[PDB]
Ligand binder design. Structure first.
Ligand code: DHT
Length: 242
């Protein structure tokens, strides 16, 4: 109904295929290379989504790219959890229409423990009865949920932007106080999942040539330049709850 939800609903990216050959057997190299390629493809959509968000041009240009390059993992995981919930009721991880992870592929990817936590996130959309509007509002907040400890180039504009995206989530929610507690808690729970994936993908990139896993260009750069800033503690998530 407001101008805010109109925009989020209008800019929400469509379907993104991974390009996975489902005829080949489920090897560690094949699954991860297809996930990597899906990441490269989704990263193009996340950029164009982010730039079309209300007030996103208020940020400094370096801060615009920085906030995208830090928050992409959590954003994509959260959207994937939503796809998994809506399509297959959180039974499998719906990374893309041509890349759906069953229990076997959770195991063959050597990421079973991480896939379990992502499936658990997907089940929370069902357990908490999250609406599409709450999903979109929450997802938009995740873009503004990880920053350098030293701060951004223009920190005031980020703070003002983050404040307003919190306000919009509180609005579309509305002893209802428990709701906001729960949604903030669910948003916080994305961050530990994203950190495990940051560690996994970083380790995988280092050893990629040995295990024949293919990393595309933007993924290789971001995982080698931006992700280690997060893993070294220079860049950290903004939690709601301590
Ligand atoms: C973001 C992606 C791809 C987009 C998505 O739907 C969620 C998914 C979560 C796991 C990521 C994957 C991109 C490729 C990664 C980073 C692998 O290198 C290891 C974990 C994978």
């Amino acid at each position: 109904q407001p101008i805010f939800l109109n925009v989020l609903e209008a800019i929400e990216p469509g379907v993104v295929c991974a390009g996975h050959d489902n005829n080949q057997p489920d090897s560690f190299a094949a699954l991860l290379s297809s996930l990597n390629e899906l990441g490269e493809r989704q990263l193009v959509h996340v950029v164009k989504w982010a730039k079309a968000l209300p007030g996103f041009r208020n940020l400094h240009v370096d801060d615009q790219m920085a906030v995208i390059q830090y928050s992409w993992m959590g954003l994509m995981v959260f959207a994937m959890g939503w796809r998994s919930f809506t399509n297959v009721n959180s039974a499998m991880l719906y990374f893309a229409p041509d890349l759906v992870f069953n229990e076997y592929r959770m195991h063959k990817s050597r990421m079973y423990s991480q896939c379990v936590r992502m499936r658990h996130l997907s089940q929370e959309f069902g357990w908490l009865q999250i609406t599409p509007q709450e999903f979109l509002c929450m997802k938009a907040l995740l873009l503004f949920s990880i920053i350098p400890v030293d701060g951004l180039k223009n920190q005031k504009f980020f703070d003002e932007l983050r404040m307003n995206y919190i306000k919009e989530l509180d609005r579309i929610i509305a002893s209802c106080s428990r709701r906001f507690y729960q949604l903030t808690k669910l948003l916080d729970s994305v961050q530990p999942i994203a950190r495990e994936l940051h560690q996994f993908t970083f380790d995988l990139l280092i050893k990629s040539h040995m295990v024949s896993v293919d990393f595309p260009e933007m993924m290789a750069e971001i995982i080698s330049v931006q992700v280690p800033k997060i893993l070294s503690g220079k860049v950290k998530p903004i939690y709601f709850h301590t």
